[PDB]
Amino acid sequence: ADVPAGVQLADKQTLVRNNGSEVQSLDPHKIEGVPESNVSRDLFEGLLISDVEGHPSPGVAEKWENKDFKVWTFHLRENAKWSDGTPVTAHDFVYSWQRLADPNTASPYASYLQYGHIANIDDIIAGKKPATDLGVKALDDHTFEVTLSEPVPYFYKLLVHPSVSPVPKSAVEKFGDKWTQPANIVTNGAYKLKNWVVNERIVLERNPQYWDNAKTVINQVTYLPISSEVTDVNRYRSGEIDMTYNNMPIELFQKLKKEIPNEVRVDPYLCTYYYEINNQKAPFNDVRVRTALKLALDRDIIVNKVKNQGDLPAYSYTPPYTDGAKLVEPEWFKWSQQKRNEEAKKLLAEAGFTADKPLTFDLLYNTSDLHKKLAIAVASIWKKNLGVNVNLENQEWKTFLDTRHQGTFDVARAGWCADYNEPTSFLNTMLSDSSNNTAHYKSPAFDKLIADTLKVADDTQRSELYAKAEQQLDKDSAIVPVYYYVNARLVKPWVGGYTGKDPLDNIYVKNLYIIKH
Ligand SMILES: N[C@@H](CCCC[NH3+])C(=O)N[C@@H](CCCC[NH3+])C(=O)O
Ligand code: IUM
Ligand code: IUM
Ligand code: IUM
Ligand code: IUM
Ligand code: IUM
Ligand code: IUM
Ligand code: IUM
């Protein structure tokens, strides 16, 4: 943290943040969501980290170089240490990326190594080669070298993600799946795990061995698992919570902006809200059915009438303001909603549905007041505009992600937030074989368009191919785009250090401080 001259600090430097739900895990190779990544950034530190404005910056690596965008060499700082006092070395990174790649780990982010194109990843994921064949090596204790199968100019931008953070081999091997318990865990970020009570709280405390510990100010941070956005706001205003989660309640948001405007933070955010269709299950394997659902949803009503928080109506998966995005707005987005409705009813009529034998299916969402209200509105709109019936179902966060990976569903609420600011952070998740692909979408034409983006050494061709890939996804109606997010949350006046400028929202509690009050 960089405390401004003249600022008076509180005697007690403690922070309480709401985290939306109970995390899937604290193991960097077993996580996939926002709540999980929020705690991971405080505990495990990879090669690079985001600074307070979101720029890729030095983490364990203090400097790095590349040869032809294919061989990347990272120089690790000599004083990087784990919470037990042992040095962080290049051997820790070799072990960790191999564990991520190994199919026996079954990481939801195994494909992150495919996105960065590390040598031999496809064969390792398929079981044809051992994980020790991965294109990474330690040249010495402080030098980590990565080899790619093709030139990737933006490779270093990927390295702030939790999936490529180091894990402690000795704890993993001795305790197996219990390595993350407080008595066994070892961490290398600014904080250490103090307490963990499932469905109550996660408490972290300063790690005195962290290399940049002299600049850390907050001594303790608590993360809570509150899924009701109303309850989060209530406990913030009562004084218990210093920072809410970034999901705001429809019941109170308008009033909050009038009552405490300076505490209501609303900033740009690279995420898309959509309804994920299970593309491999009838009758959702029929493009006429997917297209009807996509067109019949009224984005103006949802965005401006129901939520009214500043989100923008969506027509694509990748947000149009992503660095490198130059997307073409589909002609169906320009029509009236009436014209969209007629096209949708005609398509369902062609697919065999009638008044006596309508289309009926499930709409799954993760427990939340906001997602429930949005799903109710969508159900009503689809009933009125298209004559379809839906059954809403809620599931806890960890269970919800598992259901989507299994294909245990019909249609599901969904969000995707960028891991790095480049269109492939989104597009790579729709590749036929991606570990992040919960749409269960497989298109040879889509896969080829993305493969061609790193076969050219040019950005205009690259951006044009990304636009064509979005057109292919839209043509097939793989998903139902709803809105591009704004990042809305409440932050007390005494919490310093949060700029609102990072469009990925990669906060580190080591950068915050409590002003005397
Ligand atoms: N990109 C993921 C994490 C973003 C925080 C780290 N930058 C993300 O959006 N995860 C999703 C769940 C993934 C579902 C699989 N398709 C989320 O948190 O909703
Ligand atoms: O000194 U007093 O919260
Ligand atoms: O690396 U260039 O355009
Ligand atoms: O590698 U360039 O802007
Ligand atoms: O900031 U740019 O590619
Ligand atoms: O409808 U049903 O699974
Ligand atoms: O609090 U209510 O729906
Ligand atoms: O909490 U008083 O000064």
- Kindly state the tokens that stand for 288: 């006429």
Q: Euclidean distance between the first and final Cα of the chain, in Å?
A: 19
User: At which residue do the structure tokens 């993600």 appear?
Assistant: 161
- Kindly state the tokens that stand for 206: 């300063």
Tell me which method was used to determine the 3D structure: X-ray
What's the 167 CA to ligand 1 centre distance in angstroms? 21
Give, in order, the Cα–Cα distances in Å from 475 to each of 121, 228, 267.
30, 36, 31
Q: Distance (Å, rounded) from C-alpha 27 to C-alpha 49?
A: 18
What's the 405 CA to ligand 1 centre distance in angstroms? 13
Fold topology of 45-168: Dipeptide-binding Protein; domain 1 (3.90.76)
Fold topology of 1-44+169-270+487-517: D-Maltodextrin-Binding Protein; domain 2 (3.40.190)
Q: Distance (Å, rounded) from C-alpha 104 to C-alpha 354?
A: 47
Bridge partners of 491? 243
Q: Distance (Å, rounded) from C-alpha 242 to C-alpha 240?
A: 7
Query: 460: burial class by Cβ within 10 Å (0-12, 13-18, 19+)?
Result: exposed
Of the candidates 13, 80, 5, the residue with the CA atom closest to the CA atom of residue 49: 80
Of the candidates 109, 124, 131, 116, the residue with the CA atom closest to the CA atom of residue 30: 109
What's the 456 CA to ligand 3 centre distance in angstroms? 11
- Kindly state the tokens that stand for 126: 């398929």
What's the 392 CA to ligand 4 centre distance in angstroms? 46
Cβ of 459 less than 6 Å from ligand 3: yes
Contact 406, 436 (CB under 8 A): no
**Phi, psi torsion values for 45, nearest 5 degrees:** -120, 125
Ligand 1 atom nearest to 271, measured from its CA? 9
DSSP codes joined into one string, 396-416: -HHHHHHHHHHT--SEEEEEE
Strands (E), 295-454: 312-313, 360-366, 389-395, 411-417
Of the candidates 97, 76, 96, 88, the residue with the CA atom closest to the CA atom of residue 142: 76
Fold topology of 271-486: Dipeptide-binding Protein; domain 3 (3.10.105)
Bridge partners of 313? 483
Rg of the chain, C-alpha, whole Å: 23
What's the 361 CA to ligand 6 centre distance in angstroms? 5
Bridge partners of 403? none
Count Cα neighbours of 440 within 13 Å in the Cβ-side half-sphere.
18
**Residue nearest to ligand 3 atom 1, measured at CA:** 153
What is the 8-class DSSP label of residue 118? B
Contact 358, 391 (CB under 8 A): no
Q: What residues are in contact with ligand 7 under a 6 Å CB criterion? A: 230, 251, 369
Of the candidates 247, 255, 241, 257, the residue with the CA atom closest to the CA atom of residue 227: 247
Q: Which amino acid is at 208?
A: P
Q: Distance (Å, rounded) from C-alpha 489 to C-alpha 233?
A: 9
Q: Distance (Å, rounded) from C-alpha 168 to C-alpha 166?
A: 7
All structural domains of the chain with their residue ranges: 1-44+169-270+487-517, 45-168, 271-486
Q: How far is CA 105 from the centre of its chain?
A: 20
Count Cα neighbours of 471 within 13 Å in the Cβ-side half-sphere.
13
Cβ count within 10 A of residue 68: 9
Q: What residues are in contact with ligand 1 under a 6 Å CB criterion? A: 32-34, 37, 415-417, 419, 436, 438, 504
